[PDB]
Design an enzyme around this catalytic site. Structure first.
Site, PDB file in Angstrom:
ATOM      1  N   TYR A   1     -12.069  58.917  28.992  1.00  0.00           N
ATOM      2  CA  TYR A   1     -13.560  58.875  28.830  1.00  0.00           C
ATOM      3  C   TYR A   1     -14.191  57.850  29.764  1.00  0.00           C
ATOM      4  O   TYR A   1     -15.284  58.096  30.270  1.00  0.00           O
ATOM      5  CB  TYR A   1     -14.027  58.657  27.369  1.00  0.00           C
TER       6      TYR A   1
ATOM      7  N   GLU B   1      -4.247  67.038  20.579  1.00  0.00           N
ATOM      8  CA  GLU B   1      -4.862  66.950  19.268  1.00  0.00           C
ATOM      9  C   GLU B   1      -4.254  67.887  18.234  1.00  0.00           C
ATOM     10  O   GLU B   1      -4.055  67.482  17.086  1.00  0.00           O
ATOM     11  CB  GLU B   1      -6.370  67.197  19.353  1.00  0.00           C
TER      12      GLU B   1
ATOM     13  N   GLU C   1      -3.408  58.603  22.596  1.00  0.00           N
ATOM     14  CA  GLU C   1      -4.738  58.108  22.292  1.00  0.00           C
ATOM     15  C   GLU C   1      -5.210  57.065  23.298  1.00  0.00           C
ATOM     16  O   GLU C   1      -6.371  57.078  23.679  1.00  0.00           O
ATOM     17  CB  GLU C   1      -4.826  57.529  20.878  1.00  0.00           C
TER      18      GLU C   1
ATOM     19  N   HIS D   1      -1.218  66.282  17.005  1.00  0.00           N
ATOM     20  CA  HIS D   1      -1.569  65.110  16.178  1.00  0.00           C
ATOM     21  C   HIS D   1      -1.890  65.505  14.696  1.00  0.00           C
ATOM     22  O   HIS D   1      -1.410  64.866  13.736  1.00  0.00           O
ATOM     23  CB  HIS D   1      -2.775  64.381  16.759  1.00  0.00           C
TER      24      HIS D   1
ATOM     25  N   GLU E   1      -9.408  63.552  13.862  1.00  0.00           N
ATOM     26  CA  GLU E   1      -8.698  64.356  14.860  1.00  0.00           C
ATOM     27  C   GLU E   1      -8.921  65.837  14.756  1.00  0.00           C
ATOM     28  O   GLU E   1      -9.039  66.518  15.765  1.00  0.00           O
ATOM     29  CB  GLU E   1      -7.182  64.097  14.738  1.00  0.00           C
TER      30      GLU E   1
ATOM     31  N   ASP F   1     -11.465  57.545  19.552  1.00  0.00           N
ATOM     32  CA  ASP F   1     -10.094  57.306  20.118  1.00  0.00           C
ATOM     33  C   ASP F   1      -9.710  55.829  20.315  1.00  0.00           C
ATOM     34  O   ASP F   1      -8.532  55.528  20.278  1.00  0.00           O
ATOM     35  CB  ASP F   1      -9.814  58.097  21.380  1.00  0.00           C
TER      36      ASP F   1
ATOM     37  N   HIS G   1      -6.258  59.304  26.213  1.00  0.00           N
ATOM     38  CA  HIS G   1      -7.490  60.030  25.850  1.00  0.00           C
ATOM     39  C   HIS G   1      -8.662  59.101  25.973  1.00  0.00           C
ATOM     40  O   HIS G   1      -9.629  59.448  26.587  1.00  0.00           O
ATOM     41  CB  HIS G   1      -7.447  60.512  24.429  1.00  0.00           C
TER      42      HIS G   1
HETATM   43 ZN   LIG Z   1      -7.322  61.735  21.123  1.00  0.00          ZN
HETATM   44 ZN   LIG Z   2      -5.630  62.380  18.204  1.00  0.00          ZN
END
Ligand SMILES: [Zn+2]
Ligand SMILES: [Zn+2]
EC number: 1.17.4.1
Lengths: 280, 313
Positions: A89, A183, A82, A186, A149, A52, A85
């Site tokens: 993490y 996702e 993104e 995407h 993805e 990502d 995302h």
């Molecule tokens: Zn992502």
């Molecule tokens: Zn993505």
């Protein structure tokens, strides 16, 4: 592109923030998981953060390359998603593992030869576009995008959902679910762009392109299966390697179909992990 | 003269995750939000994310019912201003994002992604307001008038000429110039027009429109904070840019920009709108130019203007 505005609305409608997901119970349960479960968790989060971070950048560059305003606008929403995302993490690791361990997970990509091998297959795909942007290098990069993805993330989601079905790391599974919802759209966007490029540049709609898509998917799938053998193998109940390998092939086929292309593994016609549908 | 900039590498195994420099630095391009170069980057991200909004949460029915109750001059000014704001997506080249490709800090690159997205949403919000109030053919006419407007053509050439210097020769000096233009575009341009919307709403008219303008304007303040921070860090990183010539450049560019805003304000609003005194508005535009200069660590172009005369803002 009549589908562009409804997509824009749907992406906006799916807004979420990791700061709204309480990680306390997960933090407490993490050290109670098996050694393989904790190590695979850290490795996979390390992989997803690498993927990502790079995807944030690729998509931002893609957005400027696109000549159509509505597709560029949608690519901007995707790049922003993104960013969130990837940040999620850091949020997850800051709640679950020591800071030193968080630092180490964010250096795995530089030090693990297996992770590096697979990462450089993606980077090579993106760099050919970034260093020489043309409709052909762009089209080719989209196959890499659909791998990143639509195959790599999807393979990773199974791990988290398998913990969840065993009542483990359920808040993490919830966050993955939100990422998984984003996702899906995407992959819809990228596969749509690929199909439009073939209409706009009919010289790219050849047998050569079908073979390219197959060979690129097959290598991506081989690397995914190897990675899985390396980080998990037969050590986690609920995700055996035969079934994960069949799942990886099945998803590679699905993406080929969504690209309007031919399946690399036509013999694999059925989903071997239909239980995943209950987490999505 | 100045070294040319190298584009950000999408992947660099030889570099650390935390950037060693904003331009021509080393960065892995893997973003760990707990290990970044600037201690203000993660807090800024968090503030932007906390401020999420979309125009779909704002109901335009009351504005729609109030719109005909405004004076003819108020309705015309509104159409012209919202129409222009909606139209600018069409004829405005994204030089900021081409410059963004040279940022060798993954955290700053990510924040540029968040900015770009916010601009997408701002542009759609302007259309949303216009489409709630006028039929499609009226919108098309508004755009056609702006399409052939000379004052617009001249304003776009001022902005293009400045940003084109970076595309011709990307160096830390042309990047810094480009950052100054970014501060102007988000921190001064159309502030007269935003004031027009707030002038309606302080008198209980077109309040939903004013609310969306205020959300847009709030986002712009964080964008200006980002750009002014980059400006100051660039002077620390490339001390050769910390010259009297740079102070003169900023002062001159802000003054030209303030003058252009006043011209635009005179062209569209002037002395025709109840509640807006043109002398007070012009002083307010000077005051904004001074604020930006201060935010850049520069001297005020209009030291005589110490207070904001439009107390209601
Ligand atoms: Zn992502
Ligand atoms: Zn993505």
């Amino acid at each position: 592109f009549s589908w562009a505005y409804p997509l824009y609305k749907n992406m906006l409608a799916n807004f979420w923030t990791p700061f709204e997901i309480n990680m306390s119970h997960d933090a407490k349960q993490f050290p109670t998981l098996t050694e393989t479960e904790q190590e695979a968790f850290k490795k996979i989060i390390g992989l997803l953060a690498f993927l990502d971070s790079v995807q944030t950048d690729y998509s931002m560059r893609a957005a400027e390359y696109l000549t159509d305003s509505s597709l560029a606008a949608l690519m901007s929403v995707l790049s922003f998603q993104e960013v969130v995302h990837n940040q999620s993490y850091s949020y997850v690791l800051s709640s679950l593992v020591p800071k030193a361990t968080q630092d180490e997970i964010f250096e795995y990509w530089k030090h693990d030869d297996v992770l590096k091998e697979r990462n450089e297959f993606i980077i090579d795909g993106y760099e050919k576009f970034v260093d020489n942007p043309t409709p052909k290098t762009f089209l080719e990069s989209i196959v890499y995008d659909v791998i990143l993805e639509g195959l790599n993330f999807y393979s990773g989601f199974a791990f988290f959902y398998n913990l969840a079905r065993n009542q483990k790391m359920v808040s993490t599974s919830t966050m993955i679910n939100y990422i998984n919802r984003d996702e899906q759209l995407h992959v819809y966007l990228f596969t749509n762009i690929f199909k439009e490029l073939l209409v706009e540049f009919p010289e790219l709609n050849t047998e050569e392109t079908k073979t390219f898509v197959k060979t690129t998917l097959m290598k991506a799938a081989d690397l995914e299966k190897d990675w899985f053998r390396y980080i998990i193998g037969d050590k986690i109940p609920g995700i055996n390697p035969e079934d994960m390998e069949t799942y990886i092939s099945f998803i590679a086929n699905k993406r080929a179909v969504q690209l309007g292309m031919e399946k690399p593994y036509p013999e694999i016609k059925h989903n071997p992990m239909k239980w995943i549908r209950a987490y999505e």
